[PDB]
Amino acid sequence: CPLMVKVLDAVRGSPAINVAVHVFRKAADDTWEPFASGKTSESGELHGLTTEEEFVEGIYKVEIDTKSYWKALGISPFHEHAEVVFTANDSGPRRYTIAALLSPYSYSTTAVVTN
Amino acid sequence: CPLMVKVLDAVRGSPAINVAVHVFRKAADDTWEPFASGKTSESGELHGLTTEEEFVEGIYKVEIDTKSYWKALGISPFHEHAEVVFTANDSGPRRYTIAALLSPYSYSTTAVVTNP
Amino acid sequence: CPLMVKVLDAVRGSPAINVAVHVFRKAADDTWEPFASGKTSESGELHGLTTEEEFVEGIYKVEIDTKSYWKALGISPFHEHAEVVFTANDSGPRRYTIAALLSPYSYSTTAVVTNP
Amino acid sequence: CPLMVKVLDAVRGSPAINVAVHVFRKAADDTWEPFASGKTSESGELHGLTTEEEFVEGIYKVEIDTKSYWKALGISPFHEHAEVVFTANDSGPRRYTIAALLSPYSYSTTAVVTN
Numbered sequence: 167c168p169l170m171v172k173v174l175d176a177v178r179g180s181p182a183i184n185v186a187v188h189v190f191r192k193a194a195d196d197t198w199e200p201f202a203s204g205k206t207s208e209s210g211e212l213h214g215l216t217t218e219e220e221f222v223e224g225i226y227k228v229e230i231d232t233k234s235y236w237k238a239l240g241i242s243p244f245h246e247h248a249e250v251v252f253t254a255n256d257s258g259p260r261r262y263t264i265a266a267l268l269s270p271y272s273y274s275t276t277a278v279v280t281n
Numbered sequence: 282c283p284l285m286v287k288v289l290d291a292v293r294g295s296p297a298i299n300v301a302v303h304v305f306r307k308a309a310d311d312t313w314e315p316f317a318s319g320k321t322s323e324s325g326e327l328h329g330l331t332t333e334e335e336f337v338e339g340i341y342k343v344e345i346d347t348k349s350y351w352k353a354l355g356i357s358p359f360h361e362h363a364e365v366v367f368t369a370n371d372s373g374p375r376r377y378t379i380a381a382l383l384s385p386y387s388y389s390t391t392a393v394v395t396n397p
Numbered sequence: 398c399p400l401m402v403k404v405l406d407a408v409r410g411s412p413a414i415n416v417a418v419h420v421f422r423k424a425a426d427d428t429w430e431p432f433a434s435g436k437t438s439e440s441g442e443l444h445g446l447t448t449e450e451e452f453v454e455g456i457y458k459v460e461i462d463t464k465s466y467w468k469a470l471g472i473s474p475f476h477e478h479a480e481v482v483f484t485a486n487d488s489g490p491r492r493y494t495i496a497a498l499l500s501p502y503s504y505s506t507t508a509v510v511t512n513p
Numbered sequence: 514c515p516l517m518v519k520v521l522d523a524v525r526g527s528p529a530i531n532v533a534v535h536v537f538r539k540a541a542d543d544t545w546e547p548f549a550s551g552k553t554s555e556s557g558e559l560h561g562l563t564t565e566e567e568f569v570e571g572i573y574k575v576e577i578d579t580k581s582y583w584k585a586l587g588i589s590p591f592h593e594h595a596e597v598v599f600t601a602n603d604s605g606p607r608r609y610t611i612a613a614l615l616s617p618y619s620y621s622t623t624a625v626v627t628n
């Protein structure tokens with residue numbers, strides 16, 4: 167597992183559970199091709215998206231479906247989704263965690279890249 | 282006035298100056314049409330992107346070119362850009378400020394929405 | 398002018414209005430002496446806390462009364478307050494903006510420091 | 514372990530390792546009494562601060578020594594420390610994670626409170 171997504175809820179102080187997450191890889195023609203997807207677990211985490219063999223250098227987009235998450239909690243949100251776009255680089259550490267902290271009108275995101 | 286972008290640098294403790302920003306609007310065919318663009322000033326603010334007439338209802342994407350910002354400063358950052366995607370003006374005209382706070386491996390973004 | 402506090406609400410997408418703020422300065426005996434206080438306006442800003450003369454070098458604590466804010470809105474938040482502690486004016490006078498973005502279980506804070 | 518502290522580095526995209534963390538409990542006379550302390554691990558985490566028996570309701574302060582952290586990396590920071598002040602409440606979930614994401618002139622903090 168070289169890619170992991172962690173989502174937190176700043177309103178309830180909890181993991182953000184059952185959030186849909188879609189990962190795309192940028193194609194040669196600049197379009198976004200589907201790469202991996204899933205829903206966050208009870209811990210707010212989504213493991214098992216890809217493998218080392220599949221996760222080659224390139225530009226990836228992680229789309230977190232925040233709007234559906236907030237609406238399922240009965241809350242009106244601002245964003246359609248949260249988007250995290252980055253280059254995977256073999257020169258740096260091998261494990262990427264993309265973390266996001268969600269509020270209705272705001273989000274924060276960070277990358278934790280380790281070996 | 283109807284749309285304003287403010288960025289800030291969390292490393293320097295300063296406005297993020299000269300940050301390029303591209304705004305897109307989702308067209309009827311579901312592509313992202315270029316809507317407006319500009320650069321942040323010495324105050325980290327970008328005014329004058331659009332007008333009340335042209336800023337109709339729709340789904341908008343504000344792309345803040347964070348990589349270009351950090352690379353112009355000689356720093357190798359993580360993200361390509363920060364993208365802020367939202368429906369606007371669906372209950373009539375509002376004024377939107379999209380703010381972002383940048384670090385090399387992280388960013389925060391918020392919206393301030395006001396009704397004139 | 399030398400010290401300004403801006404808060405924002407990440408739930409509402411608005412300025413955080415009527416937020417109480419207490420500033421302290423570390424005294425020679427290492428206690429926190431009251432320095433100034435005030436409330437954010439309808440814009441989420443708090444101006445007029447101090448003067449260039451009185452805002453001397455020192456270690457300052459800006460306490461933003463987030464619990465009182467959320468409880469006045471009928472919400473039970475996690476934190477008591479947000480505390481921002483920093484050395485100021487140690488290389489001569491600067492202008493400081495302390496900003497905070499509030500959620501019930503979280504907050505972000507940043508500083509914008511400028512040299513007049 | 515009912516209390517855990519996690520610290521991340523937004524400049525390097527990493528755990529914040531070897532950060533000193535002090536926890537205080539508010540006494541009856543409104544002073545802060547030392548409660549627990551330690552240094553974050555290689556994963557940016559500090560476990561083992563307290564036990565269920567010791568961690569009674571009350572107001573706690575977690576002080577994260579961000580200034581020393583940044584200076585040890587050769588970076589000039591703004592804050593003296595980051596401070597997280599909260600009430601432990603038995604009515605809510607039993608496990609508290611206090612997370613902080615550090616930059617030189619900024620920090621973010623959240624609480625993840627679960628059962």
Ligand SMILES: Oc1cccc(-c2nnc(-c3cc(Cl)c(O)c(Cl)c3)o2)c1
Pocket residue numbers: 287289378379380381382389390391393403405496497498505506507
């Ligand atoms: O709508 C406005 C207008 C002028 C200033 C600001 C602003 N100042 N600081 C922020 C700010 C602060 C933190 Cl701590 C954040 O995490 C984010 Cl996203 C924005 O936004 C926001």
Ligand SMILES: Oc1cccc(-c2nnc(-c3cc(Cl)c(O)c(Cl)c3)o2)c1
Pocket residue numbers: 172174265266267274275276387519521610612613614621622623625
């Ligand atoms: O409880 C955990 C366990 C593992 C990782 C995290 C975590 N990772 N990132 C954060 C995080 C991210 C952002 Cl954008 C934030 O503003 C904050 Cl305060 C924490 O928290 C939090």
